[PDB]
Amino acid sequence: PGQTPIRGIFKSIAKNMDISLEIPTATSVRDMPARLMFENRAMVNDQLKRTRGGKISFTHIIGYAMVKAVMAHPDMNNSYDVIDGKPTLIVPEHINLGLAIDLPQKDGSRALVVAAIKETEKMNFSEFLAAYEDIVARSRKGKLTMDDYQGVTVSLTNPGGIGTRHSVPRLTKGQGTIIGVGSMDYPAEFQGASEDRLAELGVGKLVTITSTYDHRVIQGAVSGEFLRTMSRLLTDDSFWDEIFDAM
Amino acid sequence: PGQTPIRGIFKSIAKNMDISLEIPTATSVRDMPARLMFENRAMVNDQLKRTRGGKISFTHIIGYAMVKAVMAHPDMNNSYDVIDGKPTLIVPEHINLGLAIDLPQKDGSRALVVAAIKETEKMNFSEFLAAYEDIVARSRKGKLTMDDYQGVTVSLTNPGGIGTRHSVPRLTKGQGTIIGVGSMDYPAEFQGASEDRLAELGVGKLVTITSTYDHRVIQGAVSGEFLRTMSRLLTDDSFWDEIFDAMNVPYTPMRWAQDVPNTGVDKNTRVMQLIEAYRSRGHLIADTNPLSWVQPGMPVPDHRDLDIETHNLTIWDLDRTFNVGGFGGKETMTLREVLSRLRAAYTLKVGSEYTHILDRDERTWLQDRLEAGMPKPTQAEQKYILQKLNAAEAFENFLQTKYVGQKRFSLEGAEALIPLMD
């Protein structure tokens, strides 16, 4: 009980959230079928098991889809700044994808920092998976440099791990959009039904995806088209041929 | 038409909303099953009706759950301030819960102010309900002081009353989070379907809950874990045991489970076995003891035969219809009505044992009279019972007064013997 000054990494988090009050933001929400993901992911993990490899996750697949979508709609990668006292649009060279890694510290308090996978627009699924696992691996061993925390152009967050249906997050300065992935579960009106009965009807599972963007440089139509493309890829013949070929 | 200055309470509302522009906020949304709430709330309100009490609401239950969740995740109670020009985290002493009360004024314009229930983390459900109703009662009579509007640490709002599905509200300065409760209704793609068809599938009702928090002091993971805890409590065995204990209801609460298929032994067979169990062993849970007393050294018989789980039935069967073979003078009935009648006949103030009798005509005679019930007595009859009770107690007290030490072997505690013999 009482009052206590904020110090350390927590002070940095507080300062940046205050800075972010100067970005006008809007959000879009879309729900997508997730049956084909479950099926095809299982097929890939069976191949890896016989060849004594590892295991891929849903975040890997949605991550790769997001990259392909940003290439199709490049405006989602731009940002805003005032330079020499004039408004300015910033068009980067690469797509650097920031992952929100929740890592506990020595003290025993959870604190998140966003690390980057760099130069993603010249990768196939095999290369992408390697880079992803590289960042994660070095984070646990505590071997991340200061260069890994710089140059992020677009971010990805996963509140669905705990079981949240969707969220409306904050956007940090220096980026144009942040994408959020929600729970992959039956709706709550079906959570007491029998397997037999659901199978008869033909009920599938969902995933809800959100897009929060800076409205000075990105318009609503673009954000909508982005989410429509992501929806099409996760149920597309040609998309899964790529992944299967590479693995 | 035209322009007009803002004055009064409205000016205060405008100023505070402008101040709130300096709080960075984020929101989380989660949907939760609500079937077990409907069931167990009904069970509690039945007990209150017989004891001539009141009636509990959904806001009471969700309110209490929210309190328990804040205790499990204390970070949700903190706030931010700049003191001596340094950033600071504020950790309060108590959990004070603000209620959004919409009250019309003398003029005829609606205006809301948030009142507080204080020191909530040291309350059980009975205490909580009393405090809640206290605030509401005094608000209508116009007897709230200035102290009641101060010291709020966390707030609760209910846009679902009108029928909104969910909202994204504003957070006011001096708090860390605000929680919102949405509509408890079927989704809109089912609002034209038949009851029969929904019952077959096993479709339930929802409730959507939101959390809007200050991002300088609360992180997203904490907000998510908070909502996950609330979801678990509203479908948890131990949670409902607390509520039932505090309100003095004698039955085991309905439990949460999945719907099972109608395979193997048919469900009509199972309902007939439940009827036989109550007729045979229902006396083991009847309300026949005036004291709330269990003797410590005595064995307690098994009475697992009287709950619907042992006969492979579930909450999802309560509104379906079954063949009951003349029970209640009907060929067909719902499981809800079956339970109701069984409990009225074999679990109130009279417990009976008669199923061991070998003759069929005897058994049927007793069975018919016990299930018809006790007929309502006239006013003359009622007054006659009161005279006899009075005579008993009065006689004992007189002798106590006039002859103190003398041995008489009193009947005090058992005065109902006199009207029984009569």
Cross-sheet strand order for the largest sheet of chain A: 2-10-9-7-5-6
Shape of chain A: globular
Measured by DSSP, the beta-strand proportion of chain A falls in 15-25%
Total DSSP helices of chain A: 7
Number of strands of chain A: 10
Distance between the termini of chain A: 55 Å
Radius of gyration of chain A: 20 Å
Count interface residues per chain for the largest interface. A-B, 38 and 53 residues
Task: State the oligomer.
Answer: part of a larger assembly
Task: Work out the helicity level of chain A.
Answer: 25-40%
Task: Describe the sheet with the most strands of chain A.
Answer: 6 strands, mixed
Could you give the order of the helices and strands of chain A? EHEHHEEEEHEEEHEHH
SS-based structural class of chain A?
alpha/beta
Describe this structure as you would to a colleague:
- Chain A: Residues 1-236 are annotated as: Succinyltransferase E2.
- Chain A: This is 2-oxoglutarate dehydrogenase E1/E2 component.
- The structure is cut from a larger assembly and holds two copies of chain A.
- The first copy, chain A, has 247 residues and is α/β, with parallel strands linked by helices.
- In chain A, 36% of the residues lie in helices and 24% in strands.
- Chain A contains seven helices and ten strands.
- In chain A, the strands form two sheets. A six-stranded mixed sheet of chain A has the order 2-10-9-7-5-6, with helices on one face. In chain A, strands 3-4 form a two-stranded antiparallel sheet.
- In chain A, strand 5 and strand 6 (110-117) form a beta hairpin.
- At the A-B interface, strand 1, helix 1, strand 8 and helix 5 of A face strand 1, strand 2, strand 3 and helix 6 of B.
- Strand 8 (166-168) of chain A pairs antiparallel with strand 1 (25-33) of chain B, so a sheet runs across the interface.
